[PDB]
Paper text:
Prion disease is caused by the misfolding of normal prion protein (PrPC) to its pathogenic isoform, termed PrPSc. The host-encoded PrPC is a cell surface glycosylphosphatidylinositol (GPI)-anchored glycoprotein containing a flexible N-terminal fragment and a well-folded α-helical C-terminus. We recently reported that an anti-PrP camelid heavy chain antibody or nanobody (Nb), namely Nb484, inhibits prion conversion in cultured mouse neuronal cells in a dose-dependent manner. To understand the structural basis of Nb484 mediated inhibition, here we report two new X-ray crystal structures of mouse (Mo) PrP•Nb484 complexes at pH 6.0 and pH 8.0 resolved with a resolution of 2.1 Å and 1.2 Å, respectively; and the crystal structure of the nanobody Nb484 alone (at 1.2 Å resolution).
We also crystallized Nb484 alone and solved its structure to a high resolution (1.2 Å) by X-ray crystallography. Nb484 contains three complementarity determining regions (CDRs), each noncontiguous with the others (termed CDR1, CDR2, CDR3). These regions account for the specificity of the antibody for a particular antigenic determinant. Remarkably, the structure of the free Nb484 changes in the CDR3 from the same nanobody in complex with the MoPrP. More specifically, the orientation of the CDR3 changes upon binding with the MoPrP, thus interacting with β0-β1 loop and β2-α2 loop. The B-factors indicate that the CDR3 of the Nb484 is significantly more rigid in the MoPrP•Nb484 complex as compared to the nanobody alone. Specifically, Ile102 and Tyr103 of the Nb484 undergo major structural rearrangement towards Gly123 and stabilize the β0-β1 loop of MoPrP. In addition, Arg106 stabilizes α2 of MoPrP by binding to Asn174, His177 and Asp178, while Ala107 stabilizes the β2-α2 loop of MoPrP by binding to Gln168 and Tyr169. It thus appears that Nb484 undergoes structural changes in the CDR3 to enable a greater complementarity between the nanobody and MoPrP.
Residue numbers in the entry: 2 to 123
Amino acid sequence: VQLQESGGGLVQPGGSLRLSCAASGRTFSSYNMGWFRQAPGKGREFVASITSSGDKSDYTDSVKGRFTISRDNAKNTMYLQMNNLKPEDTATYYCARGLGIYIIRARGGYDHWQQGTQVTVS
């Protein structure tokens, strides 16, 4: 296991949830880290990602202004703060990471994947 997700569960529409993703401190700040999500019968949609240093981040259009990705390199933990949650956001959320040489938007850059956490908006 390279990545361990926390957070998830049930949320009311308009509510908030924080996801987190931990990895080893040895190499933590060498990797971009992001979140993808998957609804049954569909593919893995990019949600957000953040560069190794935390200086750059990006988001899929439908979550801009609602979700914020951040990382605490000191604590070896990355976060997705999900605010104003909507039915469209129900999915399994996967933490992913890839070497910092990749641009964060490159799907092909994500080497490691967590097991996923289910988020259901009531």
